[PDB]
């Protein structure tokens, strides 16, 4: 079966664990980012972005609502969440949230 | 001009001297013979390394000796031991050749270690001034660029070694590699001494490993690599092997730095930077040079020298594994390896404030005699940015290879998620492992079989 | 197939085995932790070097392990010490790659030294089978060809180092070399750590040394040479320096074998054989690796490895000089270096009968802290075929350089003539030296000045 | 006519000018040196030295006596005087004193 | 690069640059320097002398060589080509190089002093 | 002064010391060889030989007589002797016996 990087061998993640993941994303200053894509080749690097990184994050419910909207409009595509760092300039967290 | 034998302590003992931001410092731990004053011995260590000689000659007056002579500016006793002292030595920058590690090593540790007046000697730390560190090439890629190229975030990288040492032909080597790749692993390695033998020539091994890697990557959907050994008798042979490794499109190769030489390693680092293939470095023979406590070279100086020469991956002990390593020194020189600004802390084995000037980091690697039950504690010590290789932790699964790889990957990811959620790894590792193995039978089997083995041995280097 | 952990001694302890004329043998001296049986430790030593691992995997059954596994066939206690034993180990020939020293070193001394179950370990000797030694290149020229090319017979060769170590410009370097050469010496050498510095670039040093060599050779009428250093950070740089050294017609160059790596040294030996320029090998860093008695590598194994790789001149201690050396071991491994057939003699530090199969010899060299009064005894120990280098014995002459060179040459000739006629050097050396210095004032001055200095220090390695 | 480097187009230098030369030689801490040679080729760099540089120089008459001795023993050869500097490591002054 | 073309500035001029040691250690530096040049050319105690060939252009190869030889034999040390002489329809670079080399060799043999030409 | 390889710093060797040289030659099994030459360049290796090596030498007086005869017939040339080894195949001792 095709696999999709880390956290891809666990049974599907529950919403509460995703909320904990997001709060840990915000805890040390990483900012969220939402990407969607049609294909899942392993030689492609860039994915399509959605709005901008949410610099004014104040609660996990905001990012959860944004992911819900992302599924609402483009549900027929792979949808994933990444996290960004502004000190070392390198993303650190990447996992798949919405599978078709 | 007056010829004769001249005592050292009058010329090379200046405690009023102050280090500059340009000078290069070194720290020695030494024990002299009975009847030898400590200060004279320290003067001997300083003098014999830069310009000393057992008798003055006329040519000594044809240059400005005071500008180049090494200096010994601090001698202190260490608590708990007798006839053992620390001696600090400073060198002006005009002493060394730009961009060469071999010259530095020959100049510093060339002849002093074979002195009569010294019972034992051991170099402890080296401070690299910014003006010198700017000259060197640095690691070919570093940590950030490697992570970006390989598209792997949020988890430590995983690896395994092919077993047994020798005995396999090319096709069975490829079969084992393919089976271990498809289970859920990332990296697999050739073993240190496999270069080219009568039973298995190198071209066939390269071809079969490339085919297996391609098939597994197509099957699963993950960027998968494998270290191809390159260690060769001559520069030409190593260059040829590297060119062939590039042609097939493999993304990573390995090399032994200490047993082949810093010259070959530097040229390989330069070439692999020019052609963009990741470099993996093995620390073979290091046990000959760092085992004892009173004589030899501590590993951290070799680590700094390697980070100057070039390399992305570096073996760094296992703490709880089958090879010698103490937790304090391991953490100290790991932080020396990765970070950019490190302040002095005698508690962790670092003696001088060292600044790298944005030179990229080098990934440490833990390998040797670890299994599933070692996952939690390990992840605590190293942090996220690390590569763990299981020697017998994957192939030893009584179900073959793929079940072992799957169990290893599930265990590591469950530990990273448990720390990610906010739990304490050290205090609850057994519960996390049991809960992880509740639903995946392979992890449960590995946990059941490999809970009885522990390695608790006294540390020689204290 | 049955996975799990297994004891070593049930498989790798065969005292009924008999060595063959093909197998490669090694001797270890080891001291284990308390409570560890000796036989188990020897089994572990032979295990982790060839195929062993802490658990058994399925792939172990895919090949004929018994054909490749190492074997430990003799463990004995050494008189005068406790918990210290000799362990002999044998390896089949299919373990090693033909024509490479790096692979042999990595396979033998790669990981065993870092074992937890061992308190101290030291490799004592290596036996090279004829079938393997036939593969390697051997020294580029040897002894007979070197002597014939340089046209020097009946006396040991003479040399001198340029002092101070660093701080001289190019032209002053050339002037000092010219003065040293015209006095009657044969070789002058750069120091070990002079490669290229901000104060003295390499091209100017090469040019000026070549001019001085040419002028002195034209003036006196004797073929004179000089060792041009080559140690470089990359294979390309060293190749370029060698090409330039050839272009000017210099007959000899030098290289640091241990600190640059065996790969670079092998490629340099191959190039030197191809282009016919004599190769000089220095022995830097050796004191890091052979100083202690319980841990490290004894020098003679490095000497054998170097003789396999390639080299004409090799530093070999001074016995009475300022560097560590015991008379028995020095003589034993000197005879190991030069001769062709050597039988076992535990009194001289040689353990196995070794045959070179007509591979030419390598000239030993004594240098460091010697002066005129050391001439007789020295000539007694080494024999005729040797090269003696006086560090402070020539420039330290109160009358400059040429008087010192003339005094050295007269002293050496007088000693070789005194032994040549039939007198005993050891008992009458003072009389011979006084009689020789009767007519030449420079020798008398050197004898008068340098009769008060003696270096009598206890030997660490006993 | 074959020339002999610096100070070689003048009428022969008098002794008093030589003494002034030597005084300026020692004024800034340069040390004298005596060389004698047979041929005057312009592709040869090194010349044969005589004794050692006079580090204990106290008067120009000392170097004058040294030159006189050099002429007394090797008068059939070119004799010249050079000066060395201990801080810039490069010689600075050179001229011919005795011609065949 | 771009600062000099700004609007809010009526005039601008860079005055000095400080090079940190960590950066200056990277560069190659001059090929030889002063001390090595003086040692190679064997000239001490006096400033070096030089001359330009005039007129600017209009000389063939042989007249160029004759002028260089005549000026060199008088007691000078260096003679130079002029800035814009590279290769023209009246005088190419190979003939000029050959003739200048011949003149240098002959003058050096005649006088006994090391002589050069840019 | 021009030098002539080994034993070129002593006053001329007496006949008794040459006899000592010869018995040392014959003691370990080396055989003598007599060569003469006109030029003494250091860039030349081969010299003109005189008959054959005296394999059946029985006394130093024989080698002395041979050297005397060589001086008698070709006295206007440099004359030297050498020793040969048949085991290691390399000459070991060489020195000048008749200077000009």
From Swiss-Prot, chains A, D, F:
Heterologous expression of 12 carboxysomal genes in E.coli (ccaA, ccmK2, ccmK3, ccmK4, ccmL, ccmM, ccmN, ccmO, ccmP, rbcL, rbcS, rbcX) leads to the formation of bodies that resemble carboxysomes, have densely packed paracrystalline arrays and RuBisCO activity. These structures open the door to generating carboxysomes in plant cells to increase their photosynthesis and productivity, as well as tailoring bacterial microcompartments to specific metabolic needs and molecule delivery. It is found in: Carboxysome. GO terms for biological process: photorespiration; reductive pentose-phosphate cycle. Gene3D superfamilies: Ribulose bisphosphate carboxylase, small subunit. GO terms for cellular component: carboxysome. Keywords: Bacterial microcompartment, Calvin cycle, Carbon dioxide fixation, Carboxysome, Photorespiration, Photosynthesis. It comes from the Bacteria. RuBisCO catalyzes two reactions: the carboxylation of D-ribulose 1,5-bisphosphate, the primary event in carbon dioxide fixation, as well as the oxidative fragmentation of the pentose substrate in the photorespiration process. Both reactions occur simultaneously and in competition at the same active site. This is Ribulose bisphosphate carboxylase small subunit. It comes from Synechococcus elongatus (strain ATCC 33912 / PCC 7942 / FACHB-805) (Anacystis nidulans R2). The gene is cbbS.
Curated annotation (Swiss-Prot), chains B, C:
It comes from the Bacteria. Its cofactor is Mg(2+). It is an enzyme of class 4 (lyase). Substrate binds at residues 111, 161, 165, 283, 315, 367. InterPro entries: RuBisCO, RuBisCo_large_chain_AS, RuBisCO_lsu_C, RuBisCO_lsu_C_sf, RuBisCO_lsu_fd_N, RuBisCO_lsu_N_sf, RuBisCO_lsuI. GO terms for biological process: photorespiration; reductive pentose-phosphate cycle. Binds 1 Mg(2+) ion per subunit. One of its GO terms (molecular function) is monooxygenase activity. Its main location: other. The record marks 322 as: Transition state stabilizer. GO terms for cellular component: carboxysome. The keyword Metal-binding applies. The active site is at 163 (proton acceptor), 282 (proton acceptor). Induction: Carboxysome size and components vary with growth conditions. When grown in ambient air at medium light (50 uE meter(-2) second(-1)) there are 853 RuBisCO complexes (RbcL8S8) per carboxysome (measured using the small subunit), the numbers decrease under low light and high CO(2), and increase under high light (at protein level). The disulfide bond which can form in the large chain dimeric partners within the hexadecamer appears to be associated with oxidative stress and protein turnover. Heterologous expression of 12 carboxysomal genes in E.coli (ccaA, ccmK2, ccmK3, ccmK4, ccmL, ccmM, ccmN, ccmO, ccmP, rbcL, rbcS, rbcX) leads to the formation of bodies that resemble carboxysomes, have densely packed paracrystalline arrays and RuBisCO activity. These structures open the door to generating carboxysomes in plant cells to increase their photosynthesis and productivity, as well as tailoring bacterial microcompartments to specific metabolic needs and molecule delivery. It is found in: Carboxysome. Transmembrane segments: none annotated. CDD domains: RuBisCO_large_I (cd08212). RuBisCO catalyzes two reactions: the carboxylation of D-ribulose 1,5-bisphosphate, the primary event in carbon dioxide fixation, as well as the oxidative fragmentation of the pentose substrate in the photorespiration process. Both reactions occur simultaneously and in competition at the same active site. Beta-carboxysome assembly initiates when soluble RuBisCO is condensed into a liquid matrix in a pre-carboxysome by the RbcS-like domains of probably both CcmM58 and CcmM35. CcmN interacts with the N-terminus of CcmM58, and then recruits the CcmK2 major shell protein via CcmN's encapsulation peptide. Shell formation requires CcmK proteins and CcmO. CcmL caps the otherwise elongated carboxysome. Once fully encapsulated carboxysomes are formed, they migrate within the cell probably via interactions with the cytoskeleton. Belongs to the RuBisCO large chain family. Type I subfamily. This is Ribulose bisphosphate carboxylase large chain. It comes from Synechococcus elongatus (strain ATCC 33912 / PCC 7942 / FACHB-805) (Anacystis nidulans R2).
């Amino acid at each position: 079966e095709r696999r999709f990087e880390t956290f891809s061998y666990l049974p599907p993640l529950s919403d509460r664990q995703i909320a904990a993941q997001i709060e840990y994303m915000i805890e040390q200053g990483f900012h969220p980012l939402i990407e969607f894509n049609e294909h899942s080749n392993p030689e492609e690097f860039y994915w399509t972005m959605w709005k901008l990184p949410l610099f004014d994050c104040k609660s996990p419910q905001q990012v959860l609502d944004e992911v819900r909207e992302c599924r609402s409009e483009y549900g027929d595509c792979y949808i994933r969440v990444a996290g960004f760092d502004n000190i070392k300039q390198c993303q650190t967290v990447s996992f798949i949230v919405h599978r078709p | 001009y007056k010829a004769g034998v001249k005592d050292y302590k009058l010329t090379y003992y200046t405690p009023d001297y102050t280090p500059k931001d340009t000078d290069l410092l070194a720290a020695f731990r030494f024990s002299p013979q009975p009847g030898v004053p400590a200060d004279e011995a320290g003067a001997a260590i300083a003098a014999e390394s830069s310009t000393g000689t057992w008798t003055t000659v006329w040519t000594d007056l044809l240059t400005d000796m005071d500008r180049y002579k090494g200096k010994c500016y601090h001698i202190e006793p260490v608590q708990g031991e007798e006839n053992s002292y620390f001696a600090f030595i400073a060198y002006p920058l005009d002493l060394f050749e730009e961009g060469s590690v071999t010259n530095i090593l020959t100049s510093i540790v060339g002849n002093v270690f074979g002195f009569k007046a010294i019972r034992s000697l051991r170099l402890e730390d080296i401070r690299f001034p910014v003006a010198l560190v700017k000259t060197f090439q640095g690691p070919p890629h570093g940590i950030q660029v490697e992570r970006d190229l390989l598209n792997k975030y949020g988890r430590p990288m995983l690896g395994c070694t092919i077993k047994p040492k020798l005995g396999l032909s090319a096709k069975n080597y490829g079969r084992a590699v393919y089976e271990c790749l498809r289970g859920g692993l990332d990296f697999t390695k050739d073993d240190e001494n496999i270069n080219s033998q009568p039973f298995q020539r190198w071209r066939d091994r390269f071809l079969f490993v490339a085919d297996a890697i391609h098939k597994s990557q197509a099957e699963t959907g993950e960027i998968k690599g494998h270290y191809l050994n390159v260690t060769a008798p001559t520069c030409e042979e190593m260059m040829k092997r590297a060119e062939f490794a590039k042609e097939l499109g493999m993304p990573i190769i390995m090399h032994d730095f200490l047993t082949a030489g810093f010259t070959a390693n530097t040229t390989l680092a330069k070439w692999c930077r020019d052609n963009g293939v990741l470099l993996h470095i093995h620390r073979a023979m290091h046990a000959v040079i760092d085992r004892q406590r009173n004589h030899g070279i501590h590993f951290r100086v070799l680590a700094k020298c390697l980070r100057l020469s070039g390399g992305d991956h570096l073996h760094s002990g296992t703490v709880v594994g089958k090879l010698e390593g103490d937790k304090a020194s391991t953490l100290g020189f790991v932080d020396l390896m990765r970070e950019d600004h490190i302040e002095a802390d005698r508690s962790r084995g670092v003696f001088f404030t060292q600044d790298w000037a944005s030179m990229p980091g080098v990934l440490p690697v833990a390998s040797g005699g670890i299994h599933v039950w070692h996952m939690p504690a390990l992840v605590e010590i190293f942090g996220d940015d690390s590569v763990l290789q299981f020697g017998g932790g994957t192939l030893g699964h009584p179900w073959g290879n793929a079940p072992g790889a799957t169990a290893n990957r599930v265990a590591l990811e469950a530990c990273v998620q448990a720390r990610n959620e906010g739990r304490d790894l050290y205090r609850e590792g057994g519960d996390i492992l049991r809960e992880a193995g509740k639903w995946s039978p392979e992890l449960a089997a590995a946990l059941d079989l490999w809970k009885e083995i522990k390695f608790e041995f006294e540390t020689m280097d204290k």
